[PDB]
Symmetry: C3
């Protein structure tokens, strides 16, 4: 009850990644209640890399349209961490959502100890928050995954994508990789962002979702993304790096020398998208 | 100054619980000030079970109608914890409030070490927050209480309330207890909530307030509540468990078979309130 | 890029303090990215007393006018701490800001270990937050400063300002001090606030900014403030303590005894500003 599978309920309208999550999840339906607010933490699961959690939020009284969870899901001994969260209305007193955390410890964790510590629910519609504490402290065993360390790359505008690792669970698979930007390229561009699109030998496409990036400069970022149950008959992944370059503010028309149209800075120049292409042996 | 007794000022319009809190409180009026905002932490007190704190908030500039404290009151070595907070305007630059935290360590704590760590004041009226840090780190000695471990219960619809413990301070008293729900009952209901109402042998009623609940499933929840200075001539508590059952979304009219009115699901059925009744020896 | 020197960009319209901060800063441009939001932590610097950090915030999608950083900059082994933060729009997807934290460890710290842990970006304009994690864990070496322990004071209305310490970095200098309030004075006043204004032997004035205050009662507060690069030819600081006294709610007119105007409480009385004056040997 509420919604039967929160992972699929939340997986919209480009779709697929969460498809096998509940079945591989540990169901807990463990509850905390203060101040008219019952928080339940439903399905639980851990890549080894990323920990995803499913919850409900029920109240005595309207949360409205976009309640804000104050607090945080925290992994003990995460080295860095990144994350995401969604939430969706099912009734004006029921909400289901998902919180996701990715640690940046070099190796994956067999057991993830985490604490979900909520300190408040803001109800922006009603200008107000519900104060209190709702806490869960628990550790989860990770599903196993096969990781191979891989290489492979393509360059172009200065600006170049390196594969690092691949990891395959029963439910999903992960691509680890990073972007490098040259002194040339850094200079004409201030937001280089390298997306990968995934196919296998075989026809198929993979839906996926970033898990966050990191860097010591604004340009050389290690990233990783998670994608759909790898197809069992696939031999090879074909990876295309989409690169989205950007710099605007205001700007100029130069009706010039005549009668030709011309902007400083160059109006098509100064924020574009480019491509490349890599082959990974599932082996 | 500000308001003389924040505990009573905050205790509205069903009334009584906080009545003796200030007198048994440790007054500290310890202050922190950054960014135009002076936070004072006035009265302090600890059940052994729950820690309640009283504060003022003064600013240079309007908080408006419902300022939001970003941060948290945290008990060191709390096992779980729950809590509540209220705040009330006294001037457009003065606010008084109370924060309450309940730990779920099996035994009560003689000393409670806590940290009140504020990271911000949102001013939803003005769409804005005041960023900063205001921190108090301090430990409080608990008032003593007499706790007896008790049993006693009543069942009905599957769905059954068990007393666990009673604890009596000079200022207030606590009932520990839990609800159990059967496979039968769980199935027709998704929000069973067991409230207790308290009398003594003697006429009197007790105002009280939940301190939070906990469970490993959505149904079997350990709870506790706090109630008024127990009356000294009372011998026995008479406890009535109010049970509020719920499931709606949309719904149906069936003008049928004729001419009788009929909803799926059954429109009076599927969210009700029931009762029972228990006797506890103050002994 | 973005803005070249965030410290000066943020230093408005009484101006000077941040003027030499970037040059003495450690530039890091270390980045974290989740959920469409790239947070960069640009310039870094530490008084020994206070740690100031500069950052950018870039998004895929409007932050609007006053985004709210949920989370906190935290110093490990800070004894108490206080802080401040500003942020300013540069584009509807670019924001630059500064966060400042002051620890109240008796001695200054040669290395400050801190964690910047962001758990969310509220977008009050759009009623909404972006959930996730963006974390930086890093330690900074402090710039050296010359601290002398000093005394000196002036009294008046009961109510009296004591110098404690002075500390001079290459970029800025700090005055440590405290206010004391007598039983007389405490009684007619509930918000005594002692500001200092700074000159040297020499003509010059110093822009400065509180770093927060602390006290075990609402009145005797240790404070400190930071001011501009001390002028090299200065021999002595001339410090004037401005004292702002306050108590209003409502109030009265007494057309009386005739025809003279008279308010209870006394309408000019009950919130004023007074002064004093101290000489510190730079020695």
């Amino acid at each position: 009850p509420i919604v039967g599978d929160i992972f699929r309920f939340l997986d919209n309208g480009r779709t697929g990644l969460y498809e096998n999550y509940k079945e591989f999840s540990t169901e807990l339906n463990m509850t905390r209640e203060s101040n008219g607010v019952k928080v339940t933490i439903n399905d639980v699961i851990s890549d080894g890399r990323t920990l995803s959690i499913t919850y409900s939020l029920e109240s005595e009284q309207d949360l409205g349209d976009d309640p804000i969870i104050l607090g945080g899901l925290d992994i003990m001994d995460a080295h860095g961490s990144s994350g995401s969260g969604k939430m969706t209305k099912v009734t004006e007193k029921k909400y289901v959502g998902m919180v996701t955390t990715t640690h940046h410890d070099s190796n994956k964790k067999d057991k993830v100890n985490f604490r979900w510590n909520i300190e408040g629910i803001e109800i922006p519609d009603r200008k107000k928050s519900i104060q209190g504490h709702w806490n869960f402290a628990l550790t989860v065993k990770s599903m196993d995954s096969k990781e191979r360390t891989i290489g492979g790359s393509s360059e172009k505008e200065g600006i170049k994508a390196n594969m690092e690792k691949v990891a395959m669970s029963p439910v999903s698979f992960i691509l680890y990789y990073n972007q490098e930007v040259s002194k040339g390229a850094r200079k004409e561009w201030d937001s280089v962002d390298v997306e990968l699109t995934v196919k296998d030998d075989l026809g198929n496409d993979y839906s996926g979702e970033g898990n966050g990036g990191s860097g010591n400069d604004p340009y050389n970022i290690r990233w990783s993304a998670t994608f759909q149950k790898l197809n069992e008959n696939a031999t090879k992944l074909i990876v295309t790096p989409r690169v989205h370059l950007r710099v605007h503010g205001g700007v100029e028309y130069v009706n010039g020398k005549e009668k030709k149209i011309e902007v400083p800075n160059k109006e098509a120049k100064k924020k574009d998208i480019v491509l490349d292409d890599i082959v990974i042996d599932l082996k």
